[PDB]
C-alpha cells in the first residue's frame, strides 16, 4: 500500500507547521513598499527577498531536526542553503503566463517581472535568467504548485552536507534528515499518484544539480546596481553589492 502511515502523516503536519508563516501578511515598511512599487529597482528586489529570507530562518528554528544541531551547524546550514531555498520559493511563485513572480497576500497587479534580470549585473544576468527559466521548466505544473512538495524540496536542500560542518553528530543528523526528507517526499507523491511518482523521484537529482548551480552562481547578480542605503541588510550578506 502507498497510503501514508501515521509517522509519515505526522512528519508532514510538522513540516506544514514549520512553514505556516511563510504566507503571512507583510507589515508596512521598506519591503512591502518595494513590492507595491510599479517601477521596481534592483534594490527593491533585494528588499522583497528579505521577507522570504527572514521567514526561512524562523521556519528552520521550528524544526526538531534543525534544533538537534549545534548552533554552529545551524548557522552553516542556513548560510549554505538560503539562496537554494529562495530559488525554490521562486519556482512556487513564478507565473509562466505573466512571466512574473507574485506573492500570496497581494493580488495579481503586484508582481516582479522576469525581465528585472535585464537591469542586473551584465557579467552574470543573462545566464542566471536562463538558468532560472530552465529550472522552472523541469517541474510539472501540479508539482511546483504543491506547497508540501515545495516545502520538502526546501528541506532536502537545507539538509545538505556542508564541508564546513565538522561536528560528527551534526554531520550524522544532516545526512539522516537529507535521506529522510527525500524518502518522505517520494512517499507523499506515491500516496497521491502511485507508480507515476517514481519518475518524479528519478528527476530529483537533476533538479537539485540545477538548483545548486543557479544558487552558487547568484552572488554577484546585484553588484554595481544597488545603493546600500536603499537595500535591506540581510540579502546584502548573500549578494555582494559593492
Amino acid at each position: 500500500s502507498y497510503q501514508l502511515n501515521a509517522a509519515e502523516l505526522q512528519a508532514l503536519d510538522l513540516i506544514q507547521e514549520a512553514f505556516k508563516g511563510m504566507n503571512d501578511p507583510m507589515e508596512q515598511g521598506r519591503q512591502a513598499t518595494s513590492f507595491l512599487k510599479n517601477e521596481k529597482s534592483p534594490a527593491d528586489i533585494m528588499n522583497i527577498m528579505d521577507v522570504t529570507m527572514r521567514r526561512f530562518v524562523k521556519m528552520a528554528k521550528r524544526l526538531p531536526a534543525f534544533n538537534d544541531l549545534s548552533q554552529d551547524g545551524k548557522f552553516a546550514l542556513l548560510k549554505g542553503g538560503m539562496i537554494e531555498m529562495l530559488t525554490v520559493r521562486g519556482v512556487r511563485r513564478f507565473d509562466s503566463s505573466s512571466g512574473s513572480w507574485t506573492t500570496p497576500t497581494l493580488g495579481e497587479s503586484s508582481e516582479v517581472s522576469i525581465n528585472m534580470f535585464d537591469q542586473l549585473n551584465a557579467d552574470v544576468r543573462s545566464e542566471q535568467k536562463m538558468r532560472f527559466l530552465q529550472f522552472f521548466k523541469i517541474f510539472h505544473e501540479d508539482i511546483r504548485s504543491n506547497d508540501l512538495v515545495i516545502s520538502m524540496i526546501m528541506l532536502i536542500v537545507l539538509f545538505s552536507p556542508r564541508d564546513s560542518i565538522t561536528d560528527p553528530e551534526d554531520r550524522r543528523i544532516i545526512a539522516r534528515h537529507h535521506e529522510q526528507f527525500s524518502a518522505l517526499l517520494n512517499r507523499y507523491l506515491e500516496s497521491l499518484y502511485g507508480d507515476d511518482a517514481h519518475q518524479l523521484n528519478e528527476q530529483l537529482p537533476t533538479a537539485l544539480r540545477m538548483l545548486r548551480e543557479i544558487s552558487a552562481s547568484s552572488g554577484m547578480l546585484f553588484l554595481g546596481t544597488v545603493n546600500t542605503s536603499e537595500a535591506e541588510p540581510l540579502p546584502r550578506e548573500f549578494f555582494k553589492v559593492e
Partner: peptide, 13 residues
C-alpha cells in the same frame, strides 16, 4: 554574516 547570526540566535517569542 552578523545579521543572519543575530536572527538565528534571537528569541522570536
Amino acid at each position: 554574516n552578523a545579521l543572519l547570526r543575530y536572527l538565528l540566535d534571537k528569541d522570536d517569542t
